[PDB]
Enzyme design. Structure first.
Site, PDB file in Angstrom:
ATOM      1  N   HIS A  72      21.573  90.918  59.421  1.00 43.21           N
ATOM      2  CA  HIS A  72      21.931  89.435  58.505  1.00 43.21           C
ATOM      3  C   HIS A  72      23.150  89.437  58.185  1.00 43.21           C
ATOM      4  O   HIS A  72      23.718  88.168  58.560  1.00 43.21           O
ATOM      5  CB  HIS A  72      20.986  89.619  57.029  1.00 43.21           C
ATOM      6  CG  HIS A  72      19.679  89.848  57.333  1.00 43.21           C
ATOM      7  ND1 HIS A  72      18.691  90.277  56.300  1.00 43.21           N
ATOM      8  CD2 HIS A  72      18.546  89.577  58.251  1.00 43.21           C
ATOM      9  CE1 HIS A  72      17.578  90.284  56.920  1.00 43.21           C
ATOM     10  NE2 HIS A  72      17.468  89.890  58.031  1.00 43.21           N
TER      11      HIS A  72
ATOM     12  N   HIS B 190      14.098  82.299  59.502  1.00 48.06           N
ATOM     13  CA  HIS B 190      14.489  83.721  59.547  1.00 48.06           C
ATOM     14  C   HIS B 190      14.588  84.365  60.592  1.00 48.06           C
ATOM     15  O   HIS B 190      15.513  85.037  60.890  1.00 48.06           O
ATOM     16  CB  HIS B 190      14.030  84.505  58.369  1.00 48.06           C
ATOM     17  CG  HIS B 190      14.498  85.707  58.125  1.00 48.06           C
ATOM     18  ND1 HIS B 190      15.648  85.964  57.457  1.00 48.06           N
ATOM     19  CD2 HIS B 190      14.288  86.913  58.520  1.00 48.06           C
ATOM     20  CE1 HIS B 190      16.029  87.551  57.421  1.00 48.06           C
ATOM     21  NE2 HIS B 190      15.287  87.964  58.114  1.00 48.06           N
TER      22      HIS B 190
ATOM     23  N   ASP C 140      17.723  86.445  62.442  1.00 45.01           N
ATOM     24  CA  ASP C 140      17.431  87.863  63.223  1.00 45.01           C
ATOM     25  C   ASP C 140      17.989  87.750  64.469  1.00 45.01           C
ATOM     26  O   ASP C 140      18.656  88.729  64.807  1.00 45.01           O
ATOM     27  CB  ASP C 140      16.185  88.437  62.944  1.00 45.01           C
ATOM     28  CG  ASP C 140      16.171  88.821  61.476  1.00 45.01           C
ATOM     29  OD1 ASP C 140      17.012  88.997  60.611  1.00 45.01           O
ATOM     30  OD2 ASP C 140      14.827  89.161  60.879  1.00 45.01           O
TER      31      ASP C 140
ATOM     32  N   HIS D 110      13.263  92.182  67.235  1.00 47.76           N
ATOM     33  CA  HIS D 110      14.497  92.875  67.223  1.00 47.76           C
ATOM     34  C   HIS D 110      14.636  93.638  68.495  1.00 47.76           C
ATOM     35  O   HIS D 110      15.740  93.587  69.392  1.00 47.76           O
ATOM     36  CB  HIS D 110      14.910  93.927  66.276  1.00 47.76           C
ATOM     37  CG  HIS D 110      14.807  93.122  64.923  1.00 47.76           C
ATOM     38  ND1 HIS D 110      15.765  92.463  64.349  1.00 47.76           N
ATOM     39  CD2 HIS D 110      14.202  93.391  63.675  1.00 47.76           C
ATOM     40  CE1 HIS D 110      15.704  92.001  63.155  1.00 47.76           C
ATOM     41  NE2 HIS D 110      14.550  92.653  62.796  1.00 47.76           N
TER      42      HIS D 110
END
Ligand SMILES: C[C@@H](O)[C@H](NC(=O)c1ccc(C#CC#Cc2ccc(N)cc2)cc1)C(=O)NO
Ligand SMILES: C#Cc1ccc(C(=O)N[C@H](C(=O)N=O)[C@@H](C)O)cc1
Ligand SMILES: [Zn+2]
Length: 300
Positions: free
Chosen positions: A79, A238, A242, A265
């Protein structure tokens, strides 16, 4: 010449670690040209440096982490890393007296203000961008992520949510990256989690810093946070936050078209490494002429 940027002054902030639930002190420091983004643990003695590098990333159960040669880790970097990308910070030392970056409110916004406090200092050295030259695509089941040549930086993200609290109307988000667009559209979007899972983690002594103040939490049916969502499509916003943090693990802003479906991720990093590993698929570019600089990467 478009120049590299660092901080003008040392700043610090304090906040709970998502994992430990302990108070973490975060210190951001100016750094010289070409040294890049370095995360540093100062709880360990001697302190340990973790240069942000695509190869050093691991997708842990909670957020992500960087590892060194000995599998020592620093966690929850993504973040803050997204905020660095947003404000175009090229060189910086980031210290925490703990194993993790504080979670703050679950978004990148608190780091934006912290970086503004530190000021931006331009160094006399060309800022290097990674320009996508070939289309590069990676997959994992029905999930995929790809980069395509494009004179700018666009992100097109689709999430495959099946939760009652996420409408189909909010399954996708697409944007043209810029400092202003990141700050206003993306930076305030909070991370999120499933309450039963969080309960379990805390029953095992994990995720101890978790609270309504640092995450959107849903049960099977609805958002539990009293005030609801900051955006109707906060979840997907969000996930793009990411994505931006994941992609900036190479330490350079990318000139290209990012598109992903059900990515996370692990897959974002797999794409980053795939691109960088393929010599023909990219090249460093600088801009001696400030006019040639694409819209997305202008100063705030
Ligand atoms: C979204 C994922 O990709 C990922 N997020 C996480 O893994 C994550 C894991 C756990 C939490 C949490 C919590 C809580 C709580 C709580 C609330 C109220 C009470 N009374 C007690 C505890 C938040 C994010 C991510 O964003 N990576 O960048
Ligand atoms: C630790 C730990 C990590 C992940 C899970 C998990 O996948 N949770 C399932 C779930 O559906 N979560 O939304 C549950 C609800 O089946 C559970 C425990
Ligand atoms: Zn996140």
């Amino acid at each position: 010449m478009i120049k590299q940027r660092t901080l003008k002054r040392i700043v610090q902030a304090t906040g709970v670690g998502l994992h430990t639930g302990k108070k973490v002190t975060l210190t951001l420091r100016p750094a010289p040209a070409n040294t890049g983004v370095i995360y540093r643990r100062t709880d360990l003695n001697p302190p340990v440096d973790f240069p942000a590098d695509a190869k050093s990333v691991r997708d842990t159960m909670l957020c992500t982490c960087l590892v060194n040669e000995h599998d020592v880790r620093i966690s929850t970097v993504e973040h803050l890393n997204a905020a660095l990308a947003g404000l175009g910070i090229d060189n910086i030392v980031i210290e925490v007296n703990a194993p993790e970056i504080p979670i703050m409110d679950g978004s990148a916004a608190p780091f934006v203000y912290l970086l503004l406090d530190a000021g931006i200092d331009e160094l006399n050295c060309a800022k290097k961008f990674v320009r996508i030259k070939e289309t590069v695509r990676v997959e994992d089941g029905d999930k995929w992520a790809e980069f395509k040549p494009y004179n700018g930086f666009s992100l097109d993200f689709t999430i495959d949510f099946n939760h009652p609290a996420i409408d189909s109307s909010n399954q996708r988000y697409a944007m043209n990256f810029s400092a202003d667009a990141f700050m206003r559209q993306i930076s305030r979007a909070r991370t999120f989690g499933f309450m039963r899972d969080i309960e379990y983690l805390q029953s095992r002594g994990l995720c101890l810093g978790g609270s309504f103040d640092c995450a959107i939490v849903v049960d099977d049916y609805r958002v539990l946070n009293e005030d609801g969502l900051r955006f109707e499509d906060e979840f997907v916003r969000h996930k793009m936050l990411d994505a931006i943090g994941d992609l900036f693990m190479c330490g350079h802003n990318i000139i290209g078209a990012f598109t992903a479906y059900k990515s996370g991720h692990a897959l974002n990093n797999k794409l980053l490494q795939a691109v960088l590993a393929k010599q023909e698929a990219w090249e460093y570019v600088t801009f001696q002429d400030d006019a040639e600089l694409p819209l997305a990467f202008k100063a705030p």
